[PDB]
Amino acid sequence: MAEIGIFVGTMYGNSLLVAEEAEAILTAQGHKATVFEDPELSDWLPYQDKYVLVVTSTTGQGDLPDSIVPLFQGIKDSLGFQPNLRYGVIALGDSSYVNFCNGGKQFDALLQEQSAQRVGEMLLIDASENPEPETESNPWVEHWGTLLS
């Protein structure tokens, strides 16, 4: 039984879902998963020797929302070296933008800029084709969840 911190990062603060889905799927599979709203790096530091999940929409023109900015910067500057870390990730947005789902791909690069590891391959949701992100990310968490312990 592993421990998964799920850290949510979207420009709209209301009506979030896929984080609570991901927590619940990973819990249903048998792993101790938990959601963090308005993410602190003081809440990510507990998972340096554990697993983590990044759930983040609103990539826009290739940028992060202010809800997950301080986490992103806090990993790259306040962690800066990582001994045993692994994580998974679910990016979302509109593929009409050049860089589609770069908000979660930035989080992947972050761990690789230090020394940290990856679990499965990330989800990328296109709202232009699927405005129901739980229909994509839920079975993704149900597949990716099999990578945990």
What structural domains and CATH numbers belong to the chain? 1-149 (3.40.50.360)
Query: Closest Cα to residue 4, out of 51, 56, 71?
Result: 51
Nearest to 54 by CA among 23, 12, 29, 99: 23
Pairing of strands 88-93, 123-126: parallel
How far apart, in whole angstroms, are the C-alpha atoms of residue 135 and residue 125?
10
Task: Please state, in angstroms and rounded to a whole number, the distance separating the CA atoms of residues 3 and 94.
Answer: 31
Q: Count CB neighbours of 62 within 10 A.
A: 14
Residues 6+ apart with CB under 8 A from 13: 38, 67
**Which residues, in sequence order, are CB contacts of 90 under 8 Å at separation 6+?**
18, 22, 53, 54, 55, 56, 104, 122, 123, 125, 137, 140, 141
Sequence letter at residue 39: P
Tokens 């003081």 found at: 42
Rounded to 5°, the CA angle 48-53-59 comes to 120
Cα–Cα dist 58/145, whole Å? 24
103 near 63, Cβ under 8 Å?
yes
Q: Cβ(3)–Cβ(50) under 8 Å?
A: yes
Gap between the Cα atoms of 73 and 75, Å rounded: 6
Q: Which residue has the tokens 């990328």?
A: 124
**Per-residue b/e over 86-108, b at no fewer than 16 CB within 10 Å?**
bbbbbbbbbbeeeebbbbbbbbb
Name 89's bridge partners: 54
